[PDB]
Every structure is written in structure tokens, then in C-alpha cells.
Write an enzyme that holds these catalytic residues in place. Structure first.
Site, PDB file in Angstrom:
ATOM      1  N   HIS A 136       2.107   9.073   2.194  1.00 19.91           N
ATOM      2  CA  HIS A 136       0.806   8.902   1.520  1.00 19.91           C
ATOM      3  C   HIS A 136       0.809   9.954   0.398  1.00 19.91           C
ATOM      4  O   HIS A 136       1.293  11.082   0.600  1.00 19.91           O
ATOM      5  CB  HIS A 136      -0.379   9.139   2.453  1.00 19.91           C
ATOM      6  CG  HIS A 136      -0.322   8.303   3.698  1.00 19.91           C
ATOM      7  ND1 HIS A 136      -1.037   7.136   3.858  1.00 19.91           N
ATOM      8  CD2 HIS A 136       0.438   8.436   4.830  1.00 19.91           C
ATOM      9  CE1 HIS A 136      -0.740   6.610   5.069  1.00 19.91           C
ATOM     10  NE2 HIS A 136       0.152   7.369   5.677  1.00 19.91           N
ATOM     11  N   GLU A 196      -3.212  13.205   4.145  1.00 19.16           N
ATOM     12  CA  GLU A 196      -4.203  12.658   5.069  1.00 19.16           C
ATOM     13  C   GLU A 196      -4.779  13.768   5.922  1.00 19.16           C
ATOM     14  O   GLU A 196      -5.986  14.059   5.882  1.00 19.16           O
ATOM     15  CB  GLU A 196      -3.547  11.529   5.872  1.00 19.16           C
ATOM     16  CG  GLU A 196      -3.183  10.367   4.979  1.00 19.16           C
ATOM     17  CD  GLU A 196      -3.151   9.055   5.694  1.00 19.16           C
ATOM     18  OE1 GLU A 196      -2.435   8.962   6.728  1.00 19.16           O
ATOM     19  OE2 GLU A 196      -3.813   8.091   5.199  1.00 19.16           O
ATOM     20  N   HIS A 209       7.214   6.627   6.174  1.00 21.15           N
ATOM     21  CA  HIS A 209       6.558   6.322   4.928  1.00 21.15           C
ATOM     22  C   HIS A 209       5.801   7.574   4.489  1.00 21.15           C
ATOM     23  O   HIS A 209       5.695   8.543   5.235  1.00 21.15           O
ATOM     24  CB  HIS A 209       5.592   5.126   5.079  1.00 21.15           C
ATOM     25  CG  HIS A 209       4.533   5.448   6.107  1.00 21.15           C
ATOM     26  ND1 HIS A 209       4.692   5.198   7.460  1.00 21.15           N
ATOM     27  CD2 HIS A 209       3.312   6.053   5.949  1.00 21.15           C
ATOM     28  CE1 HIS A 209       3.603   5.659   8.081  1.00 21.15           C
ATOM     29  NE2 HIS A 209       2.723   6.190   7.202  1.00 21.15           N
ATOM     30  N   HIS A 239       5.138  10.558   7.167  1.00 29.22           N
ATOM     31  CA  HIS A 239       4.906  10.137   8.554  1.00 29.22           C
ATOM     32  C   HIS A 239       6.176   9.473   9.095  1.00 29.22           C
ATOM     33  O   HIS A 239       6.577   8.422   8.582  1.00 29.22           O
ATOM     34  CB  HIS A 239       3.733   9.157   8.607  1.00 29.22           C
ATOM     35  CG  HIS A 239       2.408   9.805   8.342  1.00 29.22           C
ATOM     36  ND1 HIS A 239       1.280   9.130   7.942  1.00 29.22           N
ATOM     37  CD2 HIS A 239       2.096  11.148   8.435  1.00 29.22           C
ATOM     38  CE1 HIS A 239       0.295  10.016   7.820  1.00 29.22           C
ATOM     39  NE2 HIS A 239       0.758  11.252   8.103  1.00 29.22           N
ATOM     40  N   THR A 256      -3.605   5.656  10.793  1.00 29.06           N
ATOM     41  CA  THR A 256      -4.451   5.959   9.657  1.00 29.06           C
ATOM     42  C   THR A 256      -4.661   4.786   8.694  1.00 29.06           C
ATOM     43  O   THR A 256      -5.437   4.917   7.752  1.00 29.06           O
ATOM     44  CB  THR A 256      -3.984   7.192   8.881  1.00 29.06           C
ATOM     45  OG1 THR A 256      -2.801   6.801   8.180  1.00 29.06           O
ATOM     46  CG2 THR A 256      -3.770   8.422   9.756  1.00 29.06           C
ATOM     47  N   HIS A 271       0.830  -1.228   0.000  1.00 27.18           N
ATOM     48  CA  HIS A 271       0.000   0.000   0.000  1.00 27.18           C
ATOM     49  C   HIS A 271       0.855   1.265   0.000  1.00 27.18           C
ATOM     50  O   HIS A 271       0.358   2.270  -0.523  1.00 27.18           O
ATOM     51  CB  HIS A 271      -1.039   0.017   1.114  1.00 27.18           C
ATOM     52  CG  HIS A 271      -0.519  -0.195   2.477  1.00 27.18           C
ATOM     53  ND1 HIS A 271      -0.136   0.810   3.340  1.00 27.18           N
ATOM     54  CD2 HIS A 271      -0.283  -1.373   3.124  1.00 27.18           C
ATOM     55  CE1 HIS A 271       0.306   0.292   4.466  1.00 27.18           C
ATOM     56  NE2 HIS A 271       0.215  -1.017   4.344  1.00 27.18           N
TER      57      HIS A 271
HETATM   58  N1  LIG Z   1       2.815   0.544  11.109  1.00 26.30           N
HETATM   59  C1  LIG Z   1       2.247   1.895  10.870  1.00 26.30           C
HETATM   60  C2  LIG Z   1       2.166   2.769  11.943  1.00 26.30           C
HETATM   61  C3  LIG Z   1       1.606   4.025  11.827  1.00 26.30           C
HETATM   62 CL1  LIG Z   1       1.526   5.004  13.131  1.00 26.30          CL
HETATM   63  C4  LIG Z   1       1.068   4.446  10.539  1.00 26.30           C
HETATM   64  S1  LIG Z   1       0.402   6.077  10.298  1.00 26.30           S
HETATM   65  N2  LIG Z   1      -0.092   6.187   8.796  1.00 26.30           N
HETATM   66  O1  LIG Z   1      -0.707   6.212  11.235  1.00 26.30           O
HETATM   67  O2  LIG Z   1       1.539   6.953  10.512  1.00 26.30           O
HETATM   68  C5  LIG Z   1       1.166   3.609   9.484  1.00 26.30           C
HETATM   69  C6  LIG Z   1       1.732   2.332   9.543  1.00 26.30           C
HETATM   70  S2  LIG Z   1       1.846   1.326   8.168  1.00 26.30           S
HETATM   71  N3  LIG Z   1       3.156   0.800   7.985  1.00 26.30           N
HETATM   72  O3  LIG Z   1       0.712   0.211   8.249  1.00 26.30           O
HETATM   73  O4  LIG Z   1       1.449   2.186   6.962  1.00 26.30           O
HETATM   74 ZN   LIG Z   2       1.000   7.156   7.524  1.00 30.86          ZN
END
Ligand SMILES: Nc1cc(Cl)c(S(N)(=O)=O)cc1S(N)(=O)=O
Ligand SMILES: [Zn+2]
Ligand SMILES: Nc1cc(Cl)c(S(N)(=O)=O)cc1S(N)(=O)=O
Ligand SMILES: [Zn+2]
Lengths: 257, 257
Positions: free
Chosen positions: B93, B103, B91, B116, B195, B61
């Protein structure tokens, strides 16, 4: 720390396990036109009616379905074999894509996966003693191609969620390995080795000619397993196959014409 | 099988993850006129000098740039936070078009992308334990707008070719996340959630006011990634953002006047 990646995969194994360059290594390419029919081979005897599975384990490179081998319950006999070999475990090797995954090849054809049913010669008393002997193990190898689902495989694929990461195990009782066998017991046989470290040269290989069919969804679930432990960065468990090794001074025999 | 498409996207997630309709979900719209300045907030402390990146992963994703979090090397402290939070990964978005992708929104403005930086509270020992706690994570969020190139981002965009499809990873050592930070550390903060599924309500969000600028060519390379695995029909990895969720009983605080 051997594995299947660029820096610890099959081309590196000889540093820790020098027998990797030995005279009877596995797997091999099966040249079907060079294999000779041996009418002195007996029919294979696969007697799995009393098999009793106990557990499934993610060992960090594949998963093993383990059996109670403390009495003769599930045995392989006949064929090229002298004496009685008891089933201890089965496991698979598979690919990232349907075009690769098998260890043995057939006229250079790679299958999507390969099933190994591992058996030890009862004359040596235990598996650990058996792997020290040139006739200690017999491995029944079965190719998997992608097409129709294998019903007898679904109980394995549905438990994989519970052993996603290295070192996890789950109870796995009452699993019947007869549901993983093709119709025909026609085979090729040759003397070889373990295909994973320690690569010991203790195996009589018996590779069935007829593949079983598994569905795309079944092999996809294999590819969702993890090489890594829980809480570590995800590394999908795919491409856990050793490529074909040099045949050297060996002959592959066929049970069929 | 959650994702971002019509039949598995954010409006579907509540069926598997009922907390999606919870009381502290993320992201949210930041109403800049309603946010109140809190002079009791301390300056943010971002200490990334010893960060050691290990690997980049296409998780189907987005992509995660992963860090060694086995000692305090890269930590977030201060601000609204009590105690010490260790960097585990970052990562992004992003959108299909420059007019969407973030987001969080700012007075309903959508940015082209959002970075993020994910950190876990060291009092809980591991990430997995931390996400079970209301103060387990701290996420530093940074908006991206399209304009001048971000030099510190180019090492990420050039490796993306090697992780085009789901489940691919690549070594990614010596990457300095300080090159992704804007000049100002002025922020908004509120209590929220992951998220993405599992949407756990464990995050203190810290969203920087100042966006970074990336070039059109840099964000175009994000949009050439694939949601799909190798050998599957191509589905471009775009629009991997959850829209703004109801603020409910929360207050957004500002670190600045
Ligand atoms: N493991 C993880 C932890 C947080 Cl905190 C977030 S986010 N988008 O809330 O920063 C996203 C992910 S992941 N890898 O599933 O996209
Ligand atoms: Zn994120
Ligand atoms: N113990 C064992 C024995 C044999 Cl014989 C083989 S194989 N691949 O040669 O069948 C593999 C393994 S294991 N569990 O390390 O993968
Ligand atoms: Zn094997």
C-alpha cells in the site's frame, strides 16, 4: 493444456493438433469484394421456437450455454445446408479491448466479440460422430459491436457471476436464443473447422453480415470471467479468439448482392 | 466496485461489507507507550529459503507477487503463532506523497508505504477456508521509508511497466522475498482483519518495528501504475491505504523491551 497465452496459445496448437495447419481451417478473413453472390443459395431457416436451454458452463476458455439436443427442438436448415442440424450449444469469443475479439474478420475489421451457435447434422446421430464428418457441423456466427445494449443478452451476463471460474456450472433454463439474432439473415458461407482444439475440419460456417449491438457494460462482464479455477491466481478470461487462418483452396459465397 | 476514491473509498465500504464496523478491524495506530512487552512471545521464524514466486498481477487496486503455496516452501511460524503459516502472496500500500501511504501508523506516524506478506494456516488446507477462521491468516507487515534504495526491491519495480493496468499479469519467477526484510525481527502483534474488502476478521497481524528504506525513484515507479484497465482514462494507482480503525477491546503486544 492448450489455451490463449504466450506459451500455449494459437501459435502452439499445431504441436498437439497438426490439423491446425490443414487445408480448411477457421476462422478466416472475409474479403467482401472477393466473395461471390450465389443465387442458388436458399434462405436460411433458423427455427428456435422450441429451444430448451439447460445449463451454462465455464469450460476454462469460454462459457457454453447448453441445450437439450435429444429431439429436434431448435434446428438450422436451408442456406448452403443439406438436411437438418440441431442446436447443441452457443458460446462467444471476445477481447480485452473493444478493438479486438472476433475470430472471423470482414475486410480485416475485427469486432469486439463473436457469437457461435453450434449445430450438428442429425444424419450422424450424435455430436461426437458428427465431428468426424466433413459436413458434420453447422456454426452460425454473429458479430458483436459495442453500442446499445442487447436486451436478450442480459440474462446471460447476469448469471456469469455464478460461473466465474473454470469448471463451474449453473442451471440456465428457458433462455431464448432468438433474442441474440440480428434483423437480417444475409450471410457468407465457406467450409472450415472448429476454431478451438481439436480443430476438426467438420464445419460449414455461416457468418451473418449484420452485427448485433451489446453495451460496454455487457462486454465488461464477459471480461470479468476467469480462465483459472477457484482458489487459483486470477487470470481474466479475455482474448479467447483464434486469428484468421489461410484461405487456401476455398471460396466464400455470399447469400446477398 | 469498492476502491479508494471519494465515492467508493474506505468510508463507503461498510455498505457492502458491514464487518467494516466490526470489533477487530485493521489497520490500527500502534501506540508504542501502551503496547506491552510480552516475554512469553517466542522469536519469529521466517523461513523463505525455498520460496518459489510465480507471477505478478495488477488487481486494480495494488499488485500481488504470488507464490506456489502447494507445499510448505515459505513459512512463517513462532512469535504469537500456533502452528505453520504458508506464504501465498505479498503486496504493498502506498501514497501519492512520501508523507502518507502506510496502513498501520506508529504513534500516529505515517510511512511512505507498507509491505504485507500474507500467509495462511496450514491446518485449514487452503486460503479460502482459512479466511473463514479467526486464526486463519498471519500477515507480516513492514514499513517503507524513502532514503537509500532497497536492492532486493528493484526486480519488482522493473516489471511494473509490463503490468501497468488492471488485469495485467506477468511471469515473475525466482524472486527472493528475503531481500525485502529489515535486519531486526522485533515486532508488534494484535488480532485484526483484512484491510481490503471483504475485511474478514481472520488475521494475526505481525508488524515489524524496523522499516526498510527504498529510494524516491523506486516509490515513484509504484505511483506510475494505473487503477484503470488498458484503453481507459488514466487514474494513477496511489493512496491505496485504509486509515487506522478503532482499537476497541484489543491489546497490542511487543516482542521487545
Ligand atoms: N487477499 C488479501 C489478503 C490480505 Cl490478508 C490482505 S491485507 N491488506 O489485509 O494484508 C490483502 C489482500 S488483497 N489481495 O485483496 O489486497
Ligand atoms: Zn495489504
Ligand atoms: N465444442 C465446440 C464446437 C465448435 Cl464448432 C466450436 S467453434 N468455436 O468452432 O464454434 C467450439 C467448441 S468449444 N466448446 O470447444 O469452444
Ligand atoms: Zn467458437
Amino acid at each position: 493444456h492448450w489455451g490463449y497465452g504466450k506459451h500455449n496459445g494459437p501459435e502452439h496448437w499445431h504441436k498437439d493438433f497438426p490439423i491446425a495447419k490443414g487445408e480448411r481451417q477457421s476462422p478466416v478473413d472475409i474479403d467482401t469484394h472477393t466473395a461471390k453472390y450465389d443465387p442458388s443459395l436458399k434462405p436460411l431457416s433458423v427455427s428456435y421456437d422450441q429451444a430448451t436451454s439447460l445449463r451454462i458452463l465455464n469450460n476454462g476458455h469460454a462459457f457454453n450455454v447448453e441445450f437439450d439436443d435429444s429431439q429436434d427442438k431448435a434446428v438450422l436448415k436451408g442456406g448452403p445446408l443439406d438436411g437438418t442440424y440441431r442446436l447443441i450449444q452457443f458460446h462467444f469469443h471476445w477481447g480485452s479491448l473493444d478493438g479486438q475479439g472476433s475470430e472471423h474478420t470482414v475486410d480485416k475489421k475485427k469486432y469486439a466479440a463473436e457469437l457461435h451457435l453450434v449445430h450438428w447434422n442429425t444424419k450422424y446421430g450424435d455430436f461426437g460422430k458428427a465431428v468426424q464428418q466433413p459436413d458434420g457441423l453447422a456454426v452460425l456466427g454473429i458479430f458483436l459491436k459495442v453500442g446499445s445494449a442487447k436486451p436478450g443478452l442480459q440474462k446471460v451476463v447476469d448469471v456469469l457471476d455464478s460461473i466465474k471460474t473454470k469448471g463451474k456450472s449453473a442451471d440456465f433454463t428457458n433462455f431464448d436464443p432468438r433474442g441474440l439474432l440480428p434483423e437480417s439473415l444475409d450471410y457468407w458461407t465457406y467450409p472450415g473447422s472448429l476454431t478451438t482444439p481439436p480443430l476438426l475440419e467438420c464445419v460449414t460456417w455461416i457468418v451473418l453480415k449484420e452485427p448485433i449491438s451489446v453495451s460496454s457494460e455487457q462486454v465488461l462482464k464477459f471480461r470479468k470471467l476467469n480462465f483459472n479455477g477457484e482458489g487459483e491466481p486470477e487470470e481474466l478470461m479475455v482474448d479467447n479468439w483464434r486469428p484468421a487462418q489461410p484461405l487456401k483452396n476455398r471460396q466464400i459465397k455470399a447469400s446477398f448482392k
